[PDB]
């Protein structure tokens with residue numbers, strides 16, 4: 001996160017850190033708890049992820065340094081990547097992780113509501129991007145979970161900012177005209193969370209952008225509302 005500040009413990013209880021175990025304990029991507037055995041994240045995070053066996057999902061974490069040998073985690077039973085996914089810049093940058101065990105909800109770990117298809121018309125004015133990603137282009141993964149408040153940008157305005165790309169309605173952009181606050185490397189897969197009528201909704205999944213926090217280059221996110229049907233298809237399969 002560029003231009004963010006440290007989160008307080010329990011502030012974003014749906015935020016998870018997805019780790020890889022080889023050769024050592026390392027953060028891979030962010031993710032969001034959406035159900036008691038379901039994490040929503042980005043498809044691009046998974047290149048080179050051959051088997052779900054190398055994954056560990058950690059919830060209720062503020063600092064990466066908390067991650068101890070005896071820290072509880074969730075194993076991943078399955079990785080479900082959208083079948084139309086090719087690359088972040090072309091969309092369909094979404095994936096589900098089915099957990100091996102159930103998350104027991106607490107003040108430190110609980111789900112975020114999906115947007116309502118009937119909420120595709122709502123205007124969110126209180127949106128935050130969170131993560132352990134870089135604070136600048138050439139950096140490293142952060143210890144403390146960072147947060148940044150960013151305004152949503154209309155699809156039409158975002159398309160003006162990325163004239164050489166196709167910004168679809170399955171993408172949502174967020175950023176300040178002058179730049180300064182944005183997601184960056186390591187933040188992908190994590191949430192773009194918006195508060196509406198006292199309820200937090202998972203509006204976006206951190207995906208891509210042209211650099212980080214640049215003037216007139218908003219961050220591009222997977223527009224979760226456009227995937228509610230896909231999510232239900234995968235999570236509610238008979």
Ligand SMILES: CC(C)CC(=O)Nc1cc(-c2ccc(C(N)=O)cc2C(=O)O)cc([C@@H]2C[C@](C)(c3ccccc3)c3cc(C(=N)N)ccc3N2)c1
Nearest residue numbers: 027028029183184185186187188207208209211212219220
């Ligand atoms: C070798 C090639 C195949 C490259 C490859 O591997 N791609 C790849 C790998 C990573 C990556 C690497 C390591 C770790 C880890 N955990 O160490 C985690 C990640 C991670 O997923 O974030 C990231 C991306 C992009 C980068 C991008 C566009 C960007 C462009 C320019 C500079 C910085 C960032 C960006 C911008 C914004 C924003 N400004 N809103 C949001 C998301 C992203 N994500 C692609």
